[PDB]
Write a protein that binds this ligand. Structure first.
Ligand SMILES: Nc1ncnc2c1ncn2[C@@H]1O[C@H](COP(=O)(O)OP(=O)(O)OP(=O)(O)O)[C@@H](O)[C@H]1O
Ligand SMILES: [K+]
Ligand SMILES: [Mg+2]
Ligand SMILES: [Zn+2]
Lengths: 283, 204, 195, 176, 461, 196
């Protein structure tokens, strides 16, 4: 991609620059000026960018980010090279495979989307991997747009023990986040952005519960729960048992079909009721 | 008696010859029977062996190769039989006793059935409804004959001398050449067909 | 004159990939009716030529005879080309034809196909000691003993060995011997996965 | 004949492998394959070598002629001459493709070898094109093509033979 | 020597790139892409190839960087390498093909384009990628690549003088090289160009207008001059939207100030783009496309599918969307034996109430038609719609310029606000709508043009 | 596994069951009638002696005899000296598709009528084929994954068969080198039946 597009669509930098805001763009411009990278070069595709700028790119980006309050710009990872052309970082392959599997193109079923994803992992099906990279770019842009819409309208409201955000059918890209895995990843990115961009200290230490429509025929909603976002989080989640205990106490119509217990399907009418129980259960 | 390796060698030689010859070549009952028998014996022997072995898999791969070659050869012969059935049957009918046959007994039965089936179909569908004097179609003239003036690539197995190349109908233009062992030539099949029959050349 | 038979020929010529169109019953009947009409007119002319000794009619008799021969040639060529396509069906699909393909064939063509199928089975049985050799298999040179196959459509139980079978459902994958999967791959039921 | 069948024929050539397993002598119909001992070289047909490599049972050894110096000399000689020169193997192209596609980790300097084999192939294909053009333009009835491999002939043989059949029929029109 | 050594090394590197580059994987296979393309094109008689900049960067990043920064010299070296590789791939060659031909190397990249407005002085002599619209094309003319010159007096000849590419001339020797002794001295400027010794290539000049969406508010669109040669010549026509790769360059005319040059400002120069590659933007058919089209045509409901695809944003109008589909495809033009023609184009008029998406439909058909022109009846004239007679600035003679219905020949012309057109202007379209020609008899020009276009008109009651 | 009956038009006689030969012999041929032909006037009632007609080649071949009893045959303009001279200048620029799809096959069958120009027709057909061979061979063996509509536009039926063979050879080698020749695939007929 282009360095500008990558900076705008990476939840880390996008959250720390508050690019959903109006001053975030100015902060990004200040960052690039501190780097000394011409705007026209950073807006060009990375492959086509002048090689002289690439010599020390990682070190200079790390230094500038350190000046701007980001200390974790660098991560230990792996890359694979073959041929003259083909070079990939591990996270690129992960994102491409995820996008192939959770594709919104409904012409193909999900078992059909699984087959595409599995095929892409073989070097004989390289075209599938590149197609997945394009799909990943689209998905990242959609994620940032949804995060901006949620944060600008104050859709993340704190109940006592947890934060609650609900997606509505009027949302443009809602269709891309109806599938549970996409919704879970979106909820995690949204919590990171919210924690970076909020003022209340209490709301920074809360977990998140997120709901999005699933089927307009049966009036079902997918509900996900994720734990608080902290730099040293144990990554442990208590929402599966809490959900099962709320549904039992309130007699709602919940379905556990995901292999993760923190993703549930709920009857929309019960939703309100459900939540109150959950509140009373966690407070 | 041929060694099995020589038997497979002759199988491959006949395979390629039939693959490039414009006509049905001579039947080779001994090759087919011996190869089928070898496959049967190998299958029986493997039945006595344990399933997990590497040796069993290697044997099975070799048997698959041999089976493919035999099947392709027989398919080629069957295609030629179906394409030229009236002429194949006519040649078999008038064959001298000494001269070798171009059909195995089973191929002959297949060809006779093919001819009878096609003739009965043509009679029952259209020809019986035509005017009385148009009811007989001579299949011998309706079906085209093999074109023996086709050009082929060949490799010389045994040296041959004084081969007459005829470029056209005019005799004055004809000349003579020598075929050396190991050499490769492009020539009309009619000139060299007996050498393919005897095994002096191999069609490639 | 022979334009109806020309239509018969053109229909087949327009499909040079071997597909079987619907049998042209009405065209064939038209050609046969024209042939009968030509024959009757020629018969009247021949009788008059004998009776009155009119030589001037001979060219007309020759013209009609040539037209009759042309009609016969076109009819026979049409039928024979259809037979060739039907024959290819056996080696491309198998012994049991899809009903879609059966629909295009005439009943007499189905009888011809059944007879040919029986003859081919007999010949294939006669090659070897037991069961002979089924030369409709092994259409390509073999590479590996086992292959990976993906189900392109729901097919149900499929026998691997007499003891054991496997259920073919869409988008499942199986690692199986090639000689048991070749036929279903050629029929479009399985897909060969290379990795 | 198609290319897969020429490759099938090429797969009968013998190559050397070092196995990592032990096996007794195998009595194949084609011929005996000597005992297999870990770490020691043994000669087997190319199809078995490729299969064993794909199953992680052996390491392949390059043929003697798959050497950069020898191949460079051969390419230069092929470019200098007018006819086809004798090739190191009757299936050099197929052997190169199979060995370098499946065992490049075992063959040092595989890229140079592939490029040299490609150079030789291009030169020989051009010579065959010149031969066909000369055959048609000069109205020959026969030709000699020595040292030409099966894969090279098969690449354009059907076209040339069909053209020659048509040309012969056009040359023999007037004979009653 | 040192410069020669550096040039030879760079040429060697380009040659190795052409010989060795491969696409594929060890799981599937490998193809020597550029060597094979060169071999096939040369055999076909097409002496050109197209090279991707990303592939060159993958093989050798420094080579791509040099080609970007100093395109002229390194492109010449790359062409020489291409000629060398073309000899090796095809070297034994059939009779009448002894002489090795020059190879034109085209350039293609995946980089994002830059605008005309962004072309600054600091980018002079650099490789640039520019989008635009072709608004004018010149006639095909001859440009010398090699010349031979001869001395008027002594007939001494200098042969095979190489010429610079682009819009650059040559300065002839001032004095001859013949022996001073014995002969009367040769005159100043003794050399003349030998007509039959000159090797020439086809050349063309184009005007490239900026994209309509890139124009700054309140400004007239800007354009740029393009220089095309060899196989790049006659590839594009006015109306084509293109992206061009080229060299930002300066016209190099005579050093002398002949005719007493008197410019309004000093040290100014004329810029142009030397074209190295063209890519026509959608806004020959590959076999994959042709198979896909045959599949579409065979769908049992293809008519419904096409109708649903016409202006899908408009809510209803199903019958009008079905008729527009027929207009887009058209009928069959025929010519009878007597010479009289029957037109196959279909004309359609929408007459109706305001705010019913009539203009939106016309805008869609402009984008959808392979050839489409949108005009307004209010902003049109009789000469503007068909063709005009005007004076040529260079020749001082009358010429002809085609109107909307000449530019839309072979396609569709959408005439909005058809009712606002003047009666004298409307009447000028009668011949073009039926006979599909435009007859002109004016200012000494008597000619007939083709106007085989479909009229799609909208109007109010 | 479907192989139509092949053309035999270049030989002494055409093939009875060949669709191409039937279509080729459907084409017309000018004739002059050498005898009154009663009771057929409706189709051209008697046809007077000396009348000039155009007949299908099969019908002309049926009525023709060496002594010219019923009719005499005239060559089409395409095979007369005027066009033979055009062919000799450069045979690569003449459009043999428009000038009779079966140009060679039709010209070959014209030799049955024993014209005084038989040697010239024969020699012209051979030289035209020789003069066009190199272009056909090059275009067929080097146009890869491209549009060939302009390359086969001017070729006749016999030449289009050679072009298809050349393309088949080029495609097979490209598939083998790219590693696509080893996958087992659905049969050609199955693909054209279930996916077309
Ligand atoms: N049926 C419709 N569906 C969708 N949008 C529509 C429809 N009808 C009108 N509109 C929108 O309303 C506006 C109509 O303006 P437009 O210029 O297309 O109308 P018009 O019929 O050409 O009118 P006029 O005769 O006044 O020029 C546009 O925004 C068009 O997109
Ligand atoms: K002036
Ligand atoms: Mg309007
Ligand atoms: Zn001088």
């Amino acid at each position: 991609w282009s360095l500008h597009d990558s900076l705008c669509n990476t939840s880390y930098t996008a959250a720390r620059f508050k690019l959903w805001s109006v001053h975030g763009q100015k902060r990004l411009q200040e960052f690039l000026a501190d780097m000394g990278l011409p705007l026209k070069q950073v807006k060009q595709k990375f492959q086509a960018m002048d090689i002289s700028l690439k010599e020390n790119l990682r070190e200079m980006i790390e230094e500038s980010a350190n000046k701007f309050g980001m200390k974790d710009m660098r991560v230990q990872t792996f890359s694979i090279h073959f041929g003259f052309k083909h070079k990939f970082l591990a996270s690129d392959v992960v994102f491409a495979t995820m996008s192939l599997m959770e594709s919104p193109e409904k012409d193909g079923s999900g078992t059909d989307h699984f087959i595409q994803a599995l095929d892409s992992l073989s070097r004989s099906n390289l075209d599938k991997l590149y197609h997945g990279l394009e799909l990943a770019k689209k998905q990242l842009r959609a994620t940032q747009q949804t995060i901006a819409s949620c944060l600008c309208t104050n859709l993340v409201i704190s109940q006592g023990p947890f934060l609650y955000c609900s997606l509505m059918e009027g949302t443009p890209d809602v269709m891309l986040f109806s599938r549970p895995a996409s919704l879970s990843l979106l909820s995690k990115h949204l919590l990171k952005s919210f924690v970076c961009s909020t003022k209340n200290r209490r709301c920074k230490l809360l977990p998140l519960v997120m709901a999005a429509p699933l089927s307009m025929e049966h009036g079902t909603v997918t509900v996900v729960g994720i734990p608080p976002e902290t730099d040293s989080s144990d990554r442990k989640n208590f929402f599966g048992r809490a959900f099962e205990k709320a549904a039992e106490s309130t007699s709602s119509r919940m379905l556990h079909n995901h292999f993760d217990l923190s993703v549930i399907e709920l009857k929309a009418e019960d939703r309100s009721k459900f939540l109150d129980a959950l509140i009373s259960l966690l407070s | 008696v041929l060694t099995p390796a020589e038997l497979i060698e002759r199988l491959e030689q006949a395979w390629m010859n039939e693959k490039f010859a414009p006509e049905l070549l001579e039947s080779k009952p001994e090759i087919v029977e011996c190869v089928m028998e070898q496959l049967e014996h190998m299958e029986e022997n493997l039945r006595r062996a344990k399933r997990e072995d590497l040796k069993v898999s290697i044997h099975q791969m070799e048997m698959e190769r041999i089976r493919y070659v035999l099947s392709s050869y027989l398919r080629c012969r069957l295609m030629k039989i179906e394409k030229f059935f009236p002429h194949v049957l006519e040649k078999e009918k008038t064959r001298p006793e000494g001269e070798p046959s171009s059909l195995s007994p089973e191929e002959l039965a297949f060809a006779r059935e093919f001819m009878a089936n096609t003739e009965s179909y043509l009679k029952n569908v259209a020809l019986k409804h035509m005017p009385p004097n148009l009811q007989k179609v001579d299949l011998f003239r309706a079906v085209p004959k093999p074109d023996l003036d086709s050009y082929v690539f060949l490799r010389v197995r045994e040296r041959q001398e004084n081969i007459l190349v005829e470029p056209d109908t005019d005799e004055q233009r004809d000349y003579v050449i020598d075929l050396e062992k190991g050499s490769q030539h492009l020539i009309r099949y009619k000139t060299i067909a007996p050498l393919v029959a005897s095994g002096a050349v191999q069609l490639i | 004159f022979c334009e109806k038979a020309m239509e018969l020929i053109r229909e087949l010529h327009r499909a040079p990939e071997g597909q079987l169109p619907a049998f042209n019953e009405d065209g064939l009947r038209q050609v046969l009716e024209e042939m009968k009409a030509l024959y009757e007119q020629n018969q009247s002319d021949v009788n008059e030529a004998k009776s009155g000794g009119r030589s001037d009619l001979i060219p007309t008799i020759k013209f009609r005879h040539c037209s009759l021969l042309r009609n016969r040639r076109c009819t026979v060529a049409y039928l024979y080309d259809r037979l060739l396509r039907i024959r290819a069906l056996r080696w491309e699909y198998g012994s049991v034809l899809p009903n879609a393909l059966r629909f295009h064939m005439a009943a007499e063509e189905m009888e011809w196909f059944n007879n040919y199928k029986r003859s081919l089975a007999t010949y294939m049985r006669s090659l070897g000691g037991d069961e002979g050799l089924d030369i409709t298999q092994d259409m390509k040179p073999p590479k590996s003993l086992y292959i990976e196959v993906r189900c392109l459509k729901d097919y149900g139980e499929f026998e691997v060995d007499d003891g054991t079978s496997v259920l073919l459902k869409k988008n499942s994958q199986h690692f199986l011997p090639r000689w048991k999967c070749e036929q279903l791959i050629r029929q479009g039921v399985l897909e060969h996965i290379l990795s | 004949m198609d290319a897969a069948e020429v490759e099938f024929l090429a797969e009968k050539e013998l190559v050397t492998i070092i196995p990592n397993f032990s096996l007794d002598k195998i009595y194949l119909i084609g011929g005996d394959l000597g005992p297999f001992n870990p770490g020691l070289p043994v000669e087997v047909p190319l199809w078995l070598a490729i299969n064993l490599k794909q199953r992680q049972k052996c390491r392949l050894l390059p043929p003697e002629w798959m050497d950069v110096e020898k191949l460079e000399k051969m390419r230069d000689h092929e470019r200098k001459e007018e006819t086809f020169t004798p090739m190191p193997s009757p299936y050099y192209m197929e052997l190169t493709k199979l060995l370098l596609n499946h065992a490049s980790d075992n063959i040092p300097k595989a890229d140079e070898i592939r490029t040299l084999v490609k150079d030789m192939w291009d030169t020989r294909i051009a010579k065959l094109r010149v031969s066909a053009d000369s055959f048609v333009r000069q109205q020959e009835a026969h030709a000699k093509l020595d040292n030409l491999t099966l894969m090279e002939i098969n690449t354009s043989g059907t076209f040339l033979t069909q053209a020659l059949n048509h040309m012969y029929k056009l040359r023999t029109n007037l004979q009653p | 020597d040192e410069g020669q050594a550096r040039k030879s090394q760079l040429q060697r590197r380009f040659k190795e790139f052409l010989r060795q580059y491969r696409v594929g994987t060890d799981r599937t296979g490998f193809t020597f892409k550029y060597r094979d393309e060169l071999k096939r094109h040369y055999n076909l008689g097409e002496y050109w190839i197209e090279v991707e900049m990303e592939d060159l960067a993958s093989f050798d990043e420094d080579l791509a960087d040099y080609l970007y920064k100093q395109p002229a010299e390194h492109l010449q070296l790359l062409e020489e390498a291409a000629k060398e590789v073309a000899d090796e791939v095809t070297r034994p060659r059939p009779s009448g093909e002894e002489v090795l031909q020059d190879i034109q190397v085209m350039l293609k990249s995946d980089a994002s384009p830059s605008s005309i407005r962004s072309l600054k002085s600091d980018m002079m002599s650099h490789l640039v990628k520019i989008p635009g619209i072709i608004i004018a094309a010149s006639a095909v003319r001859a440009k010398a690549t090699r010349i031979s010159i001869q001395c008027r007096s002594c007939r001494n000849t200098l042969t095979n003088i190489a010429m610079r590419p682009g819009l650059e001339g040559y300065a002839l020797p001032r004095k001859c090289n013949t022996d001073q002794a014995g002969r009367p001295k040769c005159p100043l400027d003794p050399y003349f160009i030998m007509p039959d010794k000159c090797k020439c290539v086809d050349f063309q000049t184009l005007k490239l207008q900026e994209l309509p969406d890139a124009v700054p508010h309140g400004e007239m669109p800007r354009h740029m001059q393009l220089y095309c040669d060899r196989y790049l010549c006659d590839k594009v026509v006015p109306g084509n939207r293109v992206t061009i790769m080229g060299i930002y360059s300066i016209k190099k005319f005579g050093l002398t100030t002949s005719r007493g040059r008197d410019r309004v400002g000093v040290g100014i120069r004329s810029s142009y783009i030397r074209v190295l590659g063209i890519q026509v933007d959608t806004d020959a058919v590959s076999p994959q496309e042709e198979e896909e089209f045959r599949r579409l045509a065979a769908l049992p409901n293809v008519y419904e599918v096409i109708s649903k695809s016409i202006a899908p944003s408009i809510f209803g109008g199903t019958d009008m969307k079905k008729a527009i589909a027929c207009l887009l495809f058209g009928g069959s033009r025929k010519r009878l034996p007597d010479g009289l023609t029957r037109r196959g184009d279909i004309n359609l008029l929408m007459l109706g109430d305001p705010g019913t998406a009539k203009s939106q439909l016309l805008k869609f058909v402009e984008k959808c038609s392979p050839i489409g022109v949108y005009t307004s009846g209010k902003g049109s004239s009789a000469a503007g719609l068909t063709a005009s007679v005007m004076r040529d600035p260079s020749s001082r003679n009358f010429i002809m310029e085609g109107g909307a219905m000449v530019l839309a020949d072979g396609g569709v012309v959408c005439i909005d606000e058809f009712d606002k057109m003047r009666e004298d202007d409307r009447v000028a379209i009668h011949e073009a709508m039926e006979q599909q020609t435009i007859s002109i008899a004016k200012a000494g020009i008597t000619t007939t043009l083709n106007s085989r276009c479909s009229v799609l008109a909208a109007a109010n009651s | 596994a479907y192989f139509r009956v092949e053309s035999g038009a270049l030989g002494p006689e055409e093939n009875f069951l060949s669709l191409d030969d039937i279509l080729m012999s459907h084409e017309k041929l000018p004739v002059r009638t050498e005898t009154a032909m009663p009771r057929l006037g409706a189709f051209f009632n008697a046809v007077p002696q000396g009348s000039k007609l155009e007949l299908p080649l099969w019908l002309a071949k049926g009525l023709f005899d060496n002594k010219r009893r019923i009719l005499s045959v005239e060559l089409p303009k395409i095979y007369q000296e005027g066009w033979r001279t055009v062919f000799s200048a450069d045979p690569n620029v003449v459009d043999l598709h428009k000038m009779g799809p079966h140009f060679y096959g039709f010209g070959s069958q014209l030799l049955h009528f024993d014209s005084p120009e038989n040697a010239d027709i024969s020699q012209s057909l051979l030289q035209t084929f020789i003069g066009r061979f190199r272009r056909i061979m090059d275009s067929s063996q080097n146009a890869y994954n491209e549009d060939t509509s302009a390359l086969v536009a001017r070729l006749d039926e016999m030449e289009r068969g050679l072009f298809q063979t050349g393309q088949k050879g080029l495609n097979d080698f490209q598939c083998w080198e790219k590693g696509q020749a080893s996958q087992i695939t659905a049969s050609n007929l199955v693909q054209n039946y279930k996916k077309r």
